[PDB]
Amino acid sequence: FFCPFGCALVDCGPNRPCRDTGFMSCDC
Fold first, then answer.
1. Rounded to 5 degrees, what angle do the CA atoms 20, 23, 26 make?
2. Is the alpha carbon torsion for 15, 21, 27, 28 positive or negative?
3. Which residue, among 21, 22, 20, 23, has the nearest Cα to 7 in the 3D structure?
4. Exposed/middle/buried for 24, CB within 10 Å: 0-12, 13-18, 19+?
5. DSSP 1-28
6. 14 with 7: CB under 8 angstroms?
């Protein structure tokens, strides 16, 4: 799902970093 600026509301919250290679594509 489209991510904002990291792990925010993704799979932990805006704290842990994730693998973002494409616009709105953060894979944690």
1. 30
2. negative
3. 20
4. exposed
5. ---SSSSTTTTS-TTS--EEEETTEEE-
6. yes
